[PDB]
Amino acid sequence: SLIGEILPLSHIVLDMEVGSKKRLFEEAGLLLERESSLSHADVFECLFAREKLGSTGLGQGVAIPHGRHAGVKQATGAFIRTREPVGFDAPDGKPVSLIFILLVPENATGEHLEVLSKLAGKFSQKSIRESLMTVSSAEEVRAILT
């Protein structure tokens, strides 16, 4: 529901050429920059402070990098489809091509676990991951993710 107001078409990338996970994270800071009240450097540190604890990869080419910060007052996200898979240090050893990033304010945690939990559910389905890997438009991506 709120996933829709959090993922506009302007926050979706369909064919990003990226070589490293570090690179992927830098590009994310840029996408979520300022519209989150934070500089891309701060958005980056926030996502990496968490990735530090361990890979946010869910297994099977999917991942959900995320972070919280007192400066964020409204949840915001983005979706990335890589041209080539990226070594994500995932739980099953396979690289990732589908990345959903989420930046949340530091307040309504419980509600956030909901968004993450629901998303993971969608990603656990083979046919959903297969669609996200073939659809041509960003609108199709949104339709599937919602």
Residue numbers in the entry: 2 to 147
Please share excerpts from the published article on this structure.
The NMB0736 gene of Neisseria meningitidis serogroup B strain MC58 encodes the putative nitrogen regulatory protein, IIANtr (abbreviated to NM-IIANtr). PTS controls sugar uptake by bacteria through a series of phosphoryl transfer reactions in which the sugar-specific IIA enzyme is phosphorylated on a highly conserved histidine residue by the histidine-containing phosphocarrier protein, HPr.
Analyses of re-dissolved crystals of the protein by mass spectrometry showed that only the un-phosphorylated form of the protein was crystallized presumably due to labile nature of the phospho-histidine bond in the acidic crystallisation conditions, 0.1 M sodium citrate, pH 4 (data not shown). The model of NM-IIANtr contains 146 (out of 149) protein residues and 72 water molecules. The structure of NM-IIANtr consists of a 5-stranded mixed β-sheet which is sandwiched by six α-helices, two on one side and four on the other. The side-chain of R69 is folded toward the active site H67 unlike the corresponding K75 of E. coli IIANtr, which is folded away from the active site H73. Interestingly, in our structure there is also a strong peak of electron density located on the 2-fold crystallographic axis, which could be modelled as a sulphate ion interacting with the side-chains of R51, H67 and R69 via salt bridge/hydrogen bonding, as well as to the equivalent residues of the symmetry related molecule.
